[PDB]
Amino acid sequence: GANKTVVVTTILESPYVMMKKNHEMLEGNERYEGYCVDLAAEIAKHCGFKYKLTIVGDGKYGARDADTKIWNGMVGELVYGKADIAIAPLTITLVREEVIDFSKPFMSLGISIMIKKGTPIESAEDLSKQTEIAYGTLDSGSTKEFFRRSKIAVFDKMWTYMRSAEPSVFVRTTAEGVARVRKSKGKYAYLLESTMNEYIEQRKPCDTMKVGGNLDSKGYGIATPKGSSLGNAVNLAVLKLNEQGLLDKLKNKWWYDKGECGS
Amino acid sequence: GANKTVVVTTILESPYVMMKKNHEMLEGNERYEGYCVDLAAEIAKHCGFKYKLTIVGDGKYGARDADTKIWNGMVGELVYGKADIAIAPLTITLVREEVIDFSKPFMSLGISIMIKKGTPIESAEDLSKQTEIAYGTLDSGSTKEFFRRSKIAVFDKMWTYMRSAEPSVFVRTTAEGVARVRKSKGKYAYLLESTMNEYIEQRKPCDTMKVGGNLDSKGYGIATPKGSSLGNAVNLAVLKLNEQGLLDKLKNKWWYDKGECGS
Numbered sequence: 283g284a285n286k287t288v289v290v291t292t293i294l295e296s297p298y299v300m301m302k303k304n305h306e307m308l309e310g311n312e313r314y315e316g317y318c319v320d321l322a323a324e325i326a327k328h329c330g331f332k333y334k335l336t337i338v339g340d341g342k343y344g345a346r347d348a349d350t351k352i353w354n355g356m357v358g359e360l361v362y363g364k365a366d367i368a369i370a371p372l373t374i375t376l377v378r379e380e381v382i383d384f385s386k387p388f389m390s391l392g393i394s395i396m397i398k399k400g401t402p403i404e405s406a407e408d409l410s411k412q413t414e415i416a417y418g419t420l421d422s423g424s425t426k427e428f429f430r431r432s433k434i435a436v437f438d439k440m441w442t443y444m445r446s447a448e449p450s451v452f453v454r455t456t457a458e459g460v461a462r463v464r465k466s467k468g469k470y471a472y473l474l475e476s477t478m479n480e481y482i483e484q485r486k487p488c489d490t491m492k493v494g495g496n497l498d499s500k501g502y503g504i505a506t507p508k509g510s511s512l513g514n515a516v517n518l519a520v521l522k523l524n525e526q527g528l529l530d531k532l533k534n535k536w537w538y539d540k541g542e543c544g545s
Numbered sequence: 546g547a548n549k550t551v552v553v554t555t556i557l558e559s560p561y562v563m564m565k566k567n568h569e570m571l572e573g574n575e576r577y578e579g580y581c582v583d584l585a586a587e588i589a590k591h592c593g594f595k596y597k598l599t600i601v602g603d604g605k606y607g608a609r610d611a612d613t614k615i616w617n618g619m620v621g622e623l624v625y626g627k628a629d630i631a632i633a634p635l636t637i638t639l640v641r642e643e644v645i646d647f648s649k650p651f652m653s654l655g656i657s658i659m660i661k662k663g664t665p666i667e668s669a670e671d672l673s674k675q676t677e678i679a680y681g682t683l684d685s686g687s688t689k690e691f692f693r694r695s696k697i698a699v700f701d702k703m704w705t706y707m708r709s710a711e712p713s714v715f716v717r718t719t720a721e722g723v724a725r726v727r728k729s730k731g732k733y734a735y736l737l738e739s740t741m742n743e744y745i746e747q748r749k750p751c752d753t754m755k756v757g758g759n760l761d762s763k764g765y766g767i768a769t770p771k772g773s774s775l776g777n778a779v780n781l782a783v784l785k786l787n788e789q790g791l792l793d794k795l796k797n798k799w800w801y802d803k804g805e806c807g808s
């Protein structure tokens with residue numbers, strides 16, 4: 283049959299996808315800006331398709347309910363045929379790979395620690411050995427799941443701490459985690475993807491820091507329904523953009539070129 | 546039909562694959578040791594296959610001759626059906642991805658600069674602006690091809706330099722490049738994958754250094770013939786090993802645990 287407009291699912295999160303300040307004046311894909319908006323356009327240009335940016339209905343990345351077996355988030359939108367491609371900071375994981383197709387990574391990263399400047403923490407081991415400085419993750423997504431599923435002693439100890447700590451150490455959004463770091467006088471540290479940590483470190487009021495090595499090493503991938511023909515072309519596009527240096531330029535544009543915390 | 550032993554192609558290069566010191570006493574897969582030997586065993590264990598380690602006949606990674614259209618190296622062994630899987634420090638590239646299947650990365654890396662300690666170079670830009678300190682790459686493989694194909698001004702200038710420099714700045718093997726750094730009194734710098742640079746930095750006589758940021762960001766993948774059923778299971782195995790922390794442990798074992806240059 284004839285070509286059809288490709289339905290892209292994504293999620294609103296700076297600096298990946300944001301409504302432009304003047305979005306009310308605009309329409310369609312032009313309402314949005316950010317790293318993933320630019321990446322979507324570069325992929326579509328290379329592959330020769332038209333597309334529509336849509337925002338994932340449930341605000342989630344993708345997990346399977348153990349009782350109902352239903353997939354939520356952007357993964358679910360692909361699994362159930364509601365979108366044709368997901369272009370987002372979506373971590374490549376085994377359980378997701380079993381149900382959807384992923385490109386090779388477009389961005390490499392790991393779980394990391396964000397502190398308020400001056401907090402006496404340098405590593406996950408440091409966090410794990412104490413409770414005065416509380417620490418936690420988002421309440422959904424791959425960072426939380428890393429701790430929940432880990433069999434590594436330090437990370438298992440951290441998960442047991444997080445489930446039992448009071449008040450709750452979990453946050454609903456990145457903005458909430460960052461605000462909690464900023465407002466807690468050194469008594470909250472936030473575990474989050476290194477990408478995001480690096481972005482926030484260059485935002486005013488310039489009071490957060492990434493510390494320590496990353497806890498793991500993984501990647502974000504472009505996702506398509508399992509077996510979709512679009513997958514091959516999108517994957518080749520990711521590889522081409524990487525080989526041309528364009529992914530590095532795009533990260534610099536959205537993270538550093540207009541950083542707010544000096545040179 | 547019945548299961549058959551899987552033919553693995555790999556290449557002899559420390560610390561990935563080496564003949565054990567006592568190899569003459571041994572037989573079969575047990576003759577070999579190293580990171581990729583251990584990785585092959587972990588993949589086979591997870592997937593439930595028996596396998597035979599073989600060494601790529603032509604000593605190459607994989608490129609296509611522009612005139613004959615023939616693929617060489619480990620890629621060629623897969624393309625032409627001489628091996629079932631390649632388990633090696635084989636870079637995921639667009640042109641290879643078009644002809645073989647790749648797992649998600651098992652190791653992330655980039656092109657990097659190796660200097661003899663004390664050489665006054667900190668970046669690729671520094672190299673590109675001068676000729677007193679000669680610099681080059683292997684004479685085959687993805688590092689050379691990065692420069693040959695680059696449209697980025699600094700790297701294109703470096704390629705033009707490398708093709709025209711005398712005496713030849715290219716080397717046939719990693720060992721030759723390292724020896725040339727070590728013997729050239731600061732007048733040769735070697736461009737090589739960061740993985741390898743990091744390994745050599747922890748080898749006696751402890752006279753080399755990795756300097757500067759990496760020039761690119763890519764990955765090694767396990768490769769199979771295009772469409773081979775083995776690909777899905779191998780890819781899931783890579784993801785599982787990564788998620789369990791085993792790939793990090795394996796790098797530490799072969800790079801750092803017995804490093805020769807201090808703690």
Ligand SMILES: CN1Cc2c(n(C[C@H](N)C(=O)O)c(=O)[nH]c2=O)C1
Pocket residue numbers: 295343344371372373374420422423424425426456473474475478
């Ligand atoms: C906006 N980012 C920051 C962030 C994200 N995720 C989702 C994850 N990439 C997934 O795919 O589930 C996390 O799990 N931890 C984080 O710190 C998404």
Ligand SMILES: CN1Cc2c(n(C[C@H](N)C(=O)O)c(=O)[nH]c2=O)C1
Pocket residue numbers: 558606607634635636637683685686687688689719736737738741
């Ligand atoms: C043993 N390593 C070191 C090294 C290798 N390669 C081959 C490359 N991974 C490929 O797949 O062509 C390079 O191109 N540059 C290097 O410095 C393999």
Ligand SMILES: [Cl-]
Pocket residue numbers: 285286287
């Ligand atoms: Cl349409």
Ligand SMILES: [Cl-]
Pocket residue numbers: 294299300301
């Ligand atoms: Cl917004």
Ligand SMILES: [Cl-]
Pocket residue numbers: 548549550
């Ligand atoms: Cl057999």
Ligand SMILES: [Cl-]
Pocket residue numbers: 557562563564
């Ligand atoms: Cl050997």
Ligand SMILES: [Li+]
Pocket residue numbers: 378379380381382383384508
């Ligand atoms: Li998949």
Ligand SMILES: [Li+]
Pocket residue numbers: 641642643644645646647771
């Ligand atoms: Li491929």
